[PDB]
Amino acid sequence: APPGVLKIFGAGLNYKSVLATARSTARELVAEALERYGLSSCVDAFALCDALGRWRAEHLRVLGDSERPLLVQELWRARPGWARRFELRGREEARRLEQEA
Amino acid sequence: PPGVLKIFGAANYKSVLATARSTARELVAEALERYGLACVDAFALCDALGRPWRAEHLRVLGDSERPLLVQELWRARPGWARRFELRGREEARRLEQEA
């Protein structure tokens, strides 16, 4: 329910804070994080990622365009002894890293 | 390390063995066979969340996603309950928003 701030970290861009409400889509937060790094066209070229590790990410998931990142942040936790953070990444790079086991 | 996942159909369920390499589409396919179907595209594997039933929030997994990792590397928010559901795509994609 309550609006939250999300720390969106840049990789190949340190984080940008973003106000996200429970009706904020991932694609909307991508656009916002993009201009907050100083960049419409290249929204689809980038991707928001739920990333996990122990800083190097050991696994990640590319969020769907109309997924709601606040709820992803809140309704799921990382398994015990794992770090977790949202990341702004090139789409092809991120979709690739989804396979690196 | 491979694991047995409970794929509920929406009480009762079918157990499938997931390897670290196994994709969501492959597990839809296998769970469909185990459900007795003679089309795989019309269904979706879902990470669903409720409380200790009916599901308050769900996420449709992508075809290429690896359910064993989804289940093991993430937890439900403390207090909530979690399971994999098998649903019709068109209905489950619609069901995501009502939360």
PDB file of C-alpha atoms in Angstrom:
ATOM      1  CA  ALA A   1       0.000   0.000   0.000  1.00  0.00           C
ATOM      2  CA  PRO A   2       2.282   2.882   1.143  1.00  0.00           C
ATOM      3  CA  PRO A   3       4.417   4.738  -1.489  1.00  0.00           C
ATOM      4  CA  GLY A   4       8.139   3.958  -1.210  1.00  0.00           C
ATOM      5  CA  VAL A   5      11.535   5.135  -2.415  1.00  0.00           C
ATOM      6  CA  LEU A   6      13.455   2.677  -4.587  1.00  0.00           C
ATOM      7  CA  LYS A   7      17.241   2.705  -4.954  1.00  0.00           C
ATOM      8  CA  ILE A   8      17.866   2.062  -8.659  1.00  0.00           C
ATOM      9  CA  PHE A   9      21.609   1.333  -9.211  1.00  0.00           C
ATOM     10  CA  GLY A  10      23.312   2.054 -12.596  1.00  0.00           C
ATOM     11  CA  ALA A  11      25.489  -0.584 -14.344  1.00  0.00           C
ATOM     12  CA  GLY A  12      27.459   0.772 -17.360  1.00  0.00           C
ATOM     13  CA  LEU A  13      25.464   3.880 -16.284  1.00  0.00           C
ATOM     14  CA  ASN A  14      26.064   4.775  -7.016  1.00  0.00           C
ATOM     15  CA  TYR A  15      22.231   4.886  -7.137  1.00  0.00           C
ATOM     16  CA  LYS A  16      19.258   7.067  -7.993  1.00  0.00           C
ATOM     17  CA  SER A  17      16.420   7.195  -5.460  1.00  0.00           C
ATOM     18  CA  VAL A  18      12.917   7.141  -7.011  1.00  0.00           C
ATOM     19  CA  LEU A  19       9.444   7.600  -5.526  1.00  0.00           C
ATOM     20  CA  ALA A  20       7.379   4.574  -6.512  1.00  0.00           C
ATOM     21  CA  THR A  21       3.683   4.056  -5.792  1.00  0.00           C
ATOM     22  CA  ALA A  22       1.915   0.636  -5.978  1.00  0.00           C
ATOM     23  CA  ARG A  23       0.604   1.589  -9.453  1.00  0.00           C
ATOM     24  CA  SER A  24       4.049   2.569 -10.848  1.00  0.00           C
ATOM     25  CA  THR A  25       5.011   0.330 -13.761  1.00  0.00           C
ATOM     26  CA  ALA A  26       8.596  -0.858 -14.238  1.00  0.00           C
ATOM     27  CA  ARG A  27       8.788   0.910 -17.634  1.00  0.00           C
ATOM     28  CA  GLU A  28       7.736   4.232 -15.987  1.00  0.00           C
ATOM     29  CA  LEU A  29      10.556   3.834 -13.429  1.00  0.00           C
ATOM     30  CA  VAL A  30      12.999   2.968 -16.224  1.00  0.00           C
ATOM     31  CA  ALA A  31      12.132   6.275 -17.977  1.00  0.00           C
ATOM     32  CA  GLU A  32      12.493   8.174 -14.674  1.00  0.00           C
ATOM     33  CA  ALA A  33      15.839   6.535 -13.757  1.00  0.00           C
ATOM     34  CA  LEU A  34      17.073   7.230 -17.304  1.00  0.00           C
ATOM     35  CA  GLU A  35      16.557  11.008 -17.223  1.00  0.00           C
ATOM     36  CA  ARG A  36      17.964  10.989 -13.632  1.00  0.00           C
ATOM     37  CA  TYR A  37      21.227   9.748 -15.247  1.00  0.00           C
ATOM     38  CA  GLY A  38      20.657  12.289 -18.074  1.00  0.00           C
ATOM     39  CA  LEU A  39      19.422  10.563 -21.234  1.00  0.00           C
ATOM     40  CA  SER A  40      11.706   8.421 -24.693  1.00  0.00           C
ATOM     41  CA  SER A  41      13.718   6.526 -27.392  1.00  0.00           C
ATOM     42  CA  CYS A  42      16.100   4.419 -25.310  1.00  0.00           C
ATOM     43  CA  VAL A  43      13.511   3.265 -22.708  1.00  0.00           C
ATOM     44  CA  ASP A  44      13.115  -0.040 -24.561  1.00  0.00           C
ATOM     45  CA  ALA A  45      16.899  -0.382 -24.848  1.00  0.00           C
ATOM     46  CA  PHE A  46      17.245  -0.540 -21.050  1.00  0.00           C
ATOM     47  CA  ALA A  47      15.731  -2.813 -18.373  1.00  0.00           C
ATOM     48  CA  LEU A  48      14.925  -2.722 -14.631  1.00  0.00           C
ATOM     49  CA  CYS A  49      16.297  -5.774 -12.823  1.00  0.00           C
ATOM     50  CA  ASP A  50      15.678  -7.498  -9.530  1.00  0.00           C
ATOM     51  CA  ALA A  51      19.329  -8.489  -8.824  1.00  0.00           C
ATOM     52  CA  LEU A  52      20.806 -10.811  -6.149  1.00  0.00           C
ATOM     53  CA  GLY A  53      24.347 -11.420  -4.787  1.00  0.00           C
ATOM     54  CA  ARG A  54      26.491 -11.369  -1.620  1.00  0.00           C
ATOM     55  CA  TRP A  55      29.431  -5.778  -5.472  1.00  0.00           C
ATOM     56  CA  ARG A  56      28.753  -8.403  -8.164  1.00  0.00           C
ATOM     57  CA  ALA A  57      25.267  -9.740  -8.992  1.00  0.00           C
ATOM     58  CA  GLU A  58      25.167 -13.570  -9.006  1.00  0.00           C
ATOM     59  CA  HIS A  59      21.685 -13.811 -10.561  1.00  0.00           C
ATOM     60  CA  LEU A  60      19.035 -11.405 -11.859  1.00  0.00           C
ATOM     61  CA  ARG A  61      15.500 -11.098 -13.241  1.00  0.00           C
ATOM     62  CA  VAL A  62      14.411  -8.563 -15.870  1.00  0.00           C
ATOM     63  CA  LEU A  63      11.130  -6.979 -14.762  1.00  0.00           C
ATOM     64  CA  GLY A  64       8.251  -6.861 -17.238  1.00  0.00           C
ATOM     65  CA  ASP A  65       7.259  -3.443 -18.638  1.00  0.00           C
ATOM     66  CA  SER A  66       4.003  -3.283 -16.666  1.00  0.00           C
ATOM     67  CA  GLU A  67       5.223  -5.077 -13.494  1.00  0.00           C
ATOM     68  CA  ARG A  68       4.966  -2.964 -10.330  1.00  0.00           C
ATOM     69  CA  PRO A  69       8.456  -2.665  -8.741  1.00  0.00           C
ATOM     70  CA  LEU A  70       7.199  -1.510  -5.326  1.00  0.00           C
ATOM     71  CA  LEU A  71       5.327  -4.824  -4.923  1.00  0.00           C
ATOM     72  CA  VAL A  72       8.309  -6.831  -6.259  1.00  0.00           C
ATOM     73  CA  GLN A  73      10.455  -5.020  -3.662  1.00  0.00           C
ATOM     74  CA  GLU A  74       7.993  -5.676  -0.836  1.00  0.00           C
ATOM     75  CA  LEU A  75       6.097  -8.953  -1.371  1.00  0.00           C
ATOM     76  CA  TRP A  76       9.305 -10.913  -1.997  1.00  0.00           C
ATOM     77  CA  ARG A  77      12.527 -11.003  -0.002  1.00  0.00           C
ATOM     78  CA  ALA A  78      15.919 -12.442  -0.993  1.00  0.00           C
ATOM     79  CA  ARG A  79      16.767 -15.861   0.491  1.00  0.00           C
ATOM     80  CA  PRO A  80      18.721 -15.669   3.801  1.00  0.00           C
ATOM     81  CA  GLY A  81      22.321 -14.472   3.349  1.00  0.00           C
ATOM     82  CA  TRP A  82      21.715 -12.787  -0.039  1.00  0.00           C
ATOM     83  CA  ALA A  83      21.883  -9.118  -0.998  1.00  0.00           C
ATOM     84  CA  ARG A  84      19.189  -7.730  -3.278  1.00  0.00           C
ATOM     85  CA  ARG A  85      18.840  -4.508  -5.297  1.00  0.00           C
ATOM     86  CA  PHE A  86      17.163  -2.941  -8.335  1.00  0.00           C
ATOM     87  CA  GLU A  87      19.484  -2.306 -11.287  1.00  0.00           C
ATOM     88  CA  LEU A  88      19.323  -0.328 -14.506  1.00  0.00           C
ATOM     89  CA  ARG A  89      20.987  -2.335 -17.270  1.00  0.00           C
ATOM     90  CA  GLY A  90      21.198  -2.692 -21.029  1.00  0.00           C
ATOM     91  CA  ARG A  91      18.384  -5.014 -22.076  1.00  0.00           C
ATOM     92  CA  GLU A  92      20.418  -7.516 -24.161  1.00  0.00           C
ATOM     93  CA  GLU A  93      23.137  -7.649 -21.464  1.00  0.00           C
ATOM     94  CA  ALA A  94      20.557  -8.329 -18.738  1.00  0.00           C
ATOM     95  CA  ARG A  95      18.513 -10.907 -20.722  1.00  0.00           C
ATOM     96  CA  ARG A  96      21.878 -12.657 -21.261  1.00  0.00           C
ATOM     97  CA  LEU A  97      22.857 -12.636 -17.550  1.00  0.00           C
ATOM     98  CA  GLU A  98      19.520 -14.344 -16.824  1.00  0.00           C
ATOM     99  CA  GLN A  99      21.180 -17.535 -18.218  1.00  0.00           C
ATOM    100  CA  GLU A 100      24.521 -17.342 -16.318  1.00  0.00           C
ATOM    101  CA  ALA A 101      23.574 -19.985 -13.664  1.00  0.00           C
TER     102      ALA A 101
ATOM    103  CA  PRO B   1      20.990 -29.127  -7.200  1.00  0.00           C
ATOM    104  CA  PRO B   2      17.667 -30.443  -8.627  1.00  0.00           C
ATOM    105  CA  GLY B   3      14.431 -30.143  -6.657  1.00  0.00           C
ATOM    106  CA  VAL B   4      10.797 -31.191  -6.547  1.00  0.00           C
ATOM    107  CA  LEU B   5       8.349 -28.338  -7.115  1.00  0.00           C
ATOM    108  CA  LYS B   6       4.636 -28.504  -6.328  1.00  0.00           C
ATOM    109  CA  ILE B   7       2.665 -27.169  -9.334  1.00  0.00           C
ATOM    110  CA  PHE B   8      -0.911 -26.431  -8.190  1.00  0.00           C
ATOM    111  CA  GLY B   9      -3.723 -26.228 -10.781  1.00  0.00           C
ATOM    112  CA  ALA B  10      -6.133 -23.249 -10.647  1.00  0.00           C
ATOM    113  CA  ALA B  11      -5.803 -27.983  -2.770  1.00  0.00           C
ATOM    114  CA  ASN B  12      -4.307 -30.754  -5.011  1.00  0.00           C
ATOM    115  CA  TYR B  13      -1.234 -30.535  -7.287  1.00  0.00           C
ATOM    116  CA  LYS B  14       1.314 -32.406  -9.423  1.00  0.00           C
ATOM    117  CA  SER B  15       4.967 -32.780  -8.298  1.00  0.00           C
ATOM    118  CA  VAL B  16       7.650 -32.080 -10.943  1.00  0.00           C
ATOM    119  CA  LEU B  17      11.448 -32.389 -10.736  1.00  0.00           C
ATOM    120  CA  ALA B  18      13.162 -29.123 -11.719  1.00  0.00           C
ATOM    121  CA  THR B  19      16.812 -28.878 -12.580  1.00  0.00           C
ATOM    122  CA  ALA B  20      18.766 -25.570 -12.394  1.00  0.00           C
ATOM    123  CA  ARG B  21      18.661 -25.533 -16.236  1.00  0.00           C
ATOM    124  CA  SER B  22      14.903 -26.266 -16.620  1.00  0.00           C
ATOM    125  CA  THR B  23      12.769 -23.477 -18.051  1.00  0.00           C
ATOM    126  CA  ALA B  24       9.239 -22.408 -17.115  1.00  0.00           C
ATOM    127  CA  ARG B  25       7.760 -23.464 -20.469  1.00  0.00           C
ATOM    128  CA  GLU B  26       9.228 -26.969 -20.090  1.00  0.00           C
ATOM    129  CA  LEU B  27       7.652 -27.277 -16.632  1.00  0.00           C
ATOM    130  CA  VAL B  28       4.266 -26.084 -17.973  1.00  0.00           C
ATOM    131  CA  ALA B  29       4.572 -28.803 -20.651  1.00  0.00           C
ATOM    132  CA  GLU B  30       5.441 -31.531 -18.109  1.00  0.00           C
ATOM    133  CA  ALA B  31       2.824 -30.489 -15.554  1.00  0.00           C
ATOM    134  CA  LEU B  32       0.233 -30.459 -18.368  1.00  0.00           C
ATOM    135  CA  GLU B  33       1.077 -34.095 -19.224  1.00  0.00           C
ATOM    136  CA  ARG B  34       0.863 -35.004 -15.524  1.00  0.00           C
ATOM    137  CA  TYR B  35      -2.553 -33.332 -15.544  1.00  0.00           C
ATOM    138  CA  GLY B  36      -3.663 -35.638 -18.389  1.00  0.00           C
ATOM    139  CA  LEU B  37      -3.920 -33.266 -21.370  1.00  0.00           C
ATOM    140  CA  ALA B  38      -3.691 -34.789 -24.886  1.00  0.00           C
ATOM    141  CA  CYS B  39      -1.741 -25.384 -26.307  1.00  0.00           C
ATOM    142  CA  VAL B  40       1.187 -25.215 -23.858  1.00  0.00           C
ATOM    143  CA  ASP B  41       1.199 -21.513 -24.903  1.00  0.00           C
ATOM    144  CA  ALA B  42      -2.342 -21.076 -23.548  1.00  0.00           C
ATOM    145  CA  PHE B  43      -1.071 -21.753 -19.997  1.00  0.00           C
ATOM    146  CA  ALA B  44       1.264 -19.968 -17.589  1.00  0.00           C
ATOM    147  CA  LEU B  45       3.363 -20.945 -14.566  1.00  0.00           C
ATOM    148  CA  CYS B  46       2.770 -18.484 -11.666  1.00  0.00           C
ATOM    149  CA  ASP B  47       4.627 -17.521  -8.497  1.00  0.00           C
ATOM    150  CA  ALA B  48       1.606 -16.787  -6.316  1.00  0.00           C
ATOM    151  CA  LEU B  49       1.330 -15.102  -2.934  1.00  0.00           C
ATOM    152  CA  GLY B  50      -1.360 -15.410  -0.261  1.00  0.00           C
ATOM    153  CA  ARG B  51      -1.629 -15.556   3.541  1.00  0.00           C
ATOM    154  CA  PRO B  52      -1.041 -18.750   5.619  1.00  0.00           C
ATOM    155  CA  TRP B  53      -6.462 -20.822  -0.387  1.00  0.00           C
ATOM    156  CA  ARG B  54      -6.886 -17.797  -2.731  1.00  0.00           C
ATOM    157  CA  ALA B  55      -3.977 -15.737  -4.126  1.00  0.00           C
ATOM    158  CA  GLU B  56      -3.617 -12.017  -3.332  1.00  0.00           C
ATOM    159  CA  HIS B  57      -0.791 -11.350  -5.818  1.00  0.00           C
ATOM    160  CA  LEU B  58       0.769 -13.416  -8.605  1.00  0.00           C
ATOM    161  CA  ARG B  59       3.558 -13.095 -11.162  1.00  0.00           C
ATOM    162  CA  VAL B  60       3.426 -15.015 -14.488  1.00  0.00           C
ATOM    163  CA  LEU B  61       6.898 -16.501 -15.130  1.00  0.00           C
ATOM    164  CA  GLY B  62       8.609 -15.895 -18.484  1.00  0.00           C
ATOM    165  CA  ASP B  63       9.012 -18.984 -20.714  1.00  0.00           C
ATOM    166  CA  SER B  64      12.809 -18.887 -20.402  1.00  0.00           C
ATOM    167  CA  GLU B  65      12.799 -18.350 -16.582  1.00  0.00           C
ATOM    168  CA  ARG B  66      14.169 -21.027 -14.301  1.00  0.00           C
ATOM    169  CA  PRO B  67      11.519 -21.957 -11.675  1.00  0.00           C
ATOM    170  CA  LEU B  68      13.945 -23.832  -9.405  1.00  0.00           C
ATOM    171  CA  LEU B  69      15.950 -20.590  -8.989  1.00  0.00           C
ATOM    172  CA  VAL B  70      12.778 -18.481  -8.606  1.00  0.00           C
ATOM    173  CA  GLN B  71      11.715 -20.710  -5.706  1.00  0.00           C
ATOM    174  CA  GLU B  72      15.099 -21.034  -4.005  1.00  0.00           C
ATOM    175  CA  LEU B  73      16.731 -17.572  -4.391  1.00  0.00           C
ATOM    176  CA  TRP B  74      13.619 -15.652  -3.294  1.00  0.00           C
ATOM    177  CA  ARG B  75      11.218 -15.909  -0.332  1.00  0.00           C
ATOM    178  CA  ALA B  76       7.738 -14.571   0.375  1.00  0.00           C
ATOM    179  CA  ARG B  77       7.519 -11.456   2.589  1.00  0.00           C
ATOM    180  CA  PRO B  78       7.559 -12.689   6.249  1.00  0.00           C
ATOM    181  CA  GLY B  79       3.999 -13.706   7.151  1.00  0.00           C
ATOM    182  CA  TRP B  80       2.899 -14.421   3.565  1.00  0.00           C
ATOM    183  CA  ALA B  81       2.516 -17.820   1.824  1.00  0.00           C
ATOM    184  CA  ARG B  82       3.860 -18.903  -1.560  1.00  0.00           C
ATOM    185  CA  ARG B  83       3.237 -21.534  -4.248  1.00  0.00           C
ATOM    186  CA  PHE B  84       3.425 -22.227  -7.968  1.00  0.00           C
ATOM    187  CA  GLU B  85       0.044 -22.137  -9.728  1.00  0.00           C
ATOM    188  CA  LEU B  86      -0.872 -23.377 -13.221  1.00  0.00           C
ATOM    189  CA  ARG B  87      -3.308 -21.051 -14.999  1.00  0.00           C
ATOM    190  CA  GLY B  88      -4.616 -20.017 -18.395  1.00  0.00           C
ATOM    191  CA  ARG B  89      -2.377 -17.343 -19.877  1.00  0.00           C
ATOM    192  CA  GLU B  90      -5.107 -14.788 -20.889  1.00  0.00           C
ATOM    193  CA  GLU B  91      -6.718 -15.054 -17.432  1.00  0.00           C
ATOM    194  CA  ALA B  92      -3.432 -15.015 -15.431  1.00  0.00           C
ATOM    195  CA  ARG B  93      -1.961 -12.034 -17.358  1.00  0.00           C
ATOM    196  CA  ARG B  94      -5.214 -10.205 -16.511  1.00  0.00           C
ATOM    197  CA  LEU B  95      -5.073 -11.471 -12.893  1.00  0.00           C
ATOM    198  CA  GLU B  96      -1.680  -9.781 -12.237  1.00  0.00           C
ATOM    199  CA  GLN B  97      -3.189  -6.245 -12.072  1.00  0.00           C
ATOM    200  CA  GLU B  98      -6.015  -6.906  -9.557  1.00  0.00           C
ATOM    201  CA  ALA B  99      -3.875  -6.575  -6.376  1.00  0.00           C
TER     202      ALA B  99
END
